[PDB]
Design a binder for this molecule. Sequence first.
Ligand SMILES: *[C@@H]1O[C@H](CO)[C@@H](O[C@@H]2O[C@H](CO)[C@@H](O[C@@H]3O[C@H](CO)[C@@H](O)[C@H](O[C@H]4O[C@H](CO)[C@@H](O)[C@H](O)[C@@H]4O)[C@@H]3O)[C@H](O)[C@H]2NC(C)=O)[C@H](O)[C@H]1NC(C)=O
Ligand SMILES: *[C@@H]1O[C@H](CO)[C@@H](O[C@@H]2O[C@H](CO)[C@@H](O)[C@H](O)[C@H]2NC(C)=O)[C@H](O)[C@H]1NC(C)=O
Ligand SMILES: *[C@@H]1O[C@H](CO)[C@@H](O[C@@H]2O[C@H](CO)[C@@H](O)[C@H](O)[C@H]2NC(C)=O)[C@H](O)[C@H]1NC(C)=O
Ligand code: NAG
Ligand code: NAG
Lengths: 106, 158, 170, 170, 222
Amino acid sequence: YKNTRKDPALIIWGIHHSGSTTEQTKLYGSGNKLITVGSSNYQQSFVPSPGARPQVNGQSGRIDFHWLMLNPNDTVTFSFNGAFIAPDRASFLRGKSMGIQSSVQV
Amino acid sequence: GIDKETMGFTYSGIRTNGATSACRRSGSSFYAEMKWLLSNTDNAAFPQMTKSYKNTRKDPALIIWGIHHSGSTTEQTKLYGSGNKLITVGSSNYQQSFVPSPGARPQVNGQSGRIDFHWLMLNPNDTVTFSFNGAFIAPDRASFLRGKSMGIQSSVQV
Amino acid sequence: GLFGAIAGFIENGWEGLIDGWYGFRHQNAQGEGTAADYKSTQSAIDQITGKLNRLIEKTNQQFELIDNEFTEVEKQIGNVINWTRDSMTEVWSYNAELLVAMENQHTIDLADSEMNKLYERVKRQLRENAEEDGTGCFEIFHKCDDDCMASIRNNTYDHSRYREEAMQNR
Amino acid sequence: GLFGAIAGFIENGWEGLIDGWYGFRHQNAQGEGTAADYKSTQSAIDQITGKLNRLIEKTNQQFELIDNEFTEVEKQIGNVINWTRDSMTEVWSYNAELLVAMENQHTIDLADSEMNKLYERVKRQLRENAEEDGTGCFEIFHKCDDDCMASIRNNTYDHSRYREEAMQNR
Amino acid sequence: QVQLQQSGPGLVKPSQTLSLTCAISGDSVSSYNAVWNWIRQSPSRGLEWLGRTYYRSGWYNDYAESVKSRITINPDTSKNQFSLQLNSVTPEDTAVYYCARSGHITVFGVNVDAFDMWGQGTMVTVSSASTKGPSVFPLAPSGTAALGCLVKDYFPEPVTVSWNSGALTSGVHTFPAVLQSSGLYSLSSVVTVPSSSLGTQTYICNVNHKPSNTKVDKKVEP
Ligand SMILES: *[C@@H]1O[C@H](CO)[C@@H](O[C@@H]2O[C@H](CO)[C@@H](O[C@@H]3O[C@H](CO)[C@@H](O)[C@H](O[C@H]4O[C@H](CO)[C@@H](O)[C@H](O)[C@@H]4O)[C@@H]3O)[C@H](O)[C@H]2NC(C)=O)[C@H](O)[C@H]1NC(C)=O
Ligand SMILES: *[C@@H]1O[C@H](CO)[C@@H](O[C@@H]2O[C@H](CO)[C@@H](O)[C@H](O)[C@H]2NC(C)=O)[C@H](O)[C@H]1NC(C)=O
Ligand SMILES: *[C@@H]1O[C@H](CO)[C@@H](O[C@@H]2O[C@H](CO)[C@@H](O)[C@H](O)[C@H]2NC(C)=O)[C@H](O)[C@H]1NC(C)=O
Ligand SMILES: *[C@@H]1O[C@H](CO)[C@@H](O)[C@H](O)[C@H]1NC(C)=O
Ligand SMILES: *[C@@H]1O[C@H](CO)[C@@H](O)[C@H](O)[C@H]1NC(C)=O
């Protein structure tokens, strides 16, 4: 994916860690999986590690989400061979705001 | 300060008494709060193991473990059997893995191997699971914090 | 007060003086009367108002969140943040305390100054026609009717008009 | 001014007084003349000079770069740095504003003080030989020639020499 | 919700005493944070302060130099009111008299004589003329209709007029009184209504002349 816009794009992806090795094979086939991700600015890799985690929302598997800012007219390449949660959309920032943490009504 | 409580881990099919001349108590010994898990005999395959501990107390538990990096690949096989080893550790809050890398480091306290120690805070009524297949220094006890203090660095007498 | 007029040689304030900060109270054949002096009162008011204009204002600098109340940041960076924030809290608490103490000292001395200035202005007006009592009163030797008292307050008083009578009365 | 001499009972300053801060202007048979007083002028100058010696100086502390203008640091640490720097900017801007305001108040009151001190010094010199006008002038009852005026300025003036003539002129 | 309510006769004979009362609600006549004033207004003299009273750990009074020899303003702490007493009145004392609170509103605790609340006013006429009642005549309506009431030959001012005991206000105009050559006042009050409502709606003007204790109602019909 090339960012053809004048501002940086926020790109997300996920690595799925199944609750067991057998689940990993069922979903993506056997073998030691790999995901690489690179831009002109960024350089990083991911190999999944399946295994039993305690159940959260009824699930013993986990997804590692990752992010990068893709510069104007730079390209991100996803080379993967399983256990990859692919982005459907890129995010762009609209302008300026302020974020707060609150427990009371607007 | 710290209050200590047993992790409640028991073991079968492996040795639990790894010791070294680097940790002496009138003879070879080891970290008092940890256990050096070895294959039952030399060059034997360490079995694929899982061990679980739930924090049943109202404050977070400090959990420690260690990954052993032998001074050579042959030493790694002698202690834990051949093959590419793995240790995973997860809680509801924490998510991380470890594969050992043996190799010659310069001798410190007469040893060319190393232990990577790691830690996490285990929340009240959360569970930590250790899935390992060798090169793992297991905790014997969890630590709990007693209350409040101040720590200083000093070179003079009390 | 630094000058020694308010809570000084002037024994005490007047609760009846509701229209001004500083004023005159006279005694003559016609009786007694009290009147506020607005020029001195306004000078004091304008100066206090100036301090408030300075202190009640914008710090335009806007600060964003740098930590998280719901999901705590890493402990090392979190401790650096807290140490820095607590250091700033210490600086500002110290600054605020010293500012208010300094301004209050000056405000009290300022009011005391304006009272003294009014007293000395009157003393100069009726030179050789009256004498300082020591309670912030001027004992006037010649007869001074309400029009004469009002001339002192007004600042039109002409001492040469009554000097022969007043001087000879010593 | 706190004392009420400058911009007070002294109506206004003299543009012609170019050689000094404070001075004397006289009227006598021989005419009019103006002269600056250096002792009072120097005291004021020395004190202002002292403030400048204090304020124009070294902060020996040297600060290195902790971020990077060409290749931006990590966003979390970068935000902590910026927050800390902006907090320091806020403290120093506040400090500078308050310093200058405080020093300026004192500088104005200081000049007003020196003017008052000179006036009172003269008043004491010619006790019972003259009377306060109220414009910062002393009406002198005896004849006072240029040598007599210069004796007042010089501070050698001897009131007992002219007291019989001056006192009897009341 | 401070409220100043004024009472007292609006007719005083020359050389006699004008006496008015202001009754306070929502605040205390002896409050540290109030000053109680009287002010009068005439088309000639304009607005003129008369005097005041206030409590600051003892009662104080100040009066305008123009009335100082004739005037007394006293607090009543039993009824929470204060009065105005003006002796030896002359035609030059004919005016509207207002009570007013000041010194509630201050610059750094200094009463700056801001009059933040006023009474409704009492119109006072100095005259030796006996009061007279006002005759009230209908101004009959002959798709908008106008009807009214002529309020004729009364003294002194004022007269108040309402319609249907205050239930009708829209389209009402009550004209300022005119002094006739007889030395008596007259005015009219008029209202425009839908001409259709004439056959169903009753229209009554309610006329009040407090100086003569006159309250009169008059039905106005086609
Ligand atoms: C030192 O000087 C200051 C002024 O710089 C002075 O402060 C003033 O205090 C009064 C209260 O006593 C404030 O007045 C309020 O104004 C608001 C509208 O702005 C009103 O809504 C308030 O009304 C209340 O009380 C009424 C009855 O009295 C009720 O009817 C109503 O429901 C409310 O309860 C009230 O009038 C005034 O705003 C300040 N001034 C400023 C600038 O803030 C202060 O009192 C002085 N100190 C001393 C000890 O005198
Ligand atoms: C930084 O300070 C905050 C408070 O200013 C600490 O968070 C609080 O911790 C107490 C008990 O230790 C909790 O009960 C509160 O819920 C916390 N308050 C907030 C506002 O978060 C925080 O622990 C400090 N950071 C570190 C790293 O210790
Ligand atoms: C910390 O502050 C600096 C500026 O003081 C920020 O860098 C600037 O960002 C603007 C637009 O956001 C750029 O146009 C400038 O080139 C930058 N100036 C400099 C001097 O670098 C920086 O973004 C801030 N740090 C973070 C993490 O947001
Ligand atoms: C000052 O007050 C007096 C009252 O005695 C008045 O007659 C006089 O005109 C006033 N001065 C001026 C300049 O108006
Ligand atoms: C002061 O000035 C006068 C000029 O009148 C001069 O004669 C006198 O000597 C001076 N005083 C001293 C101490 O020199």
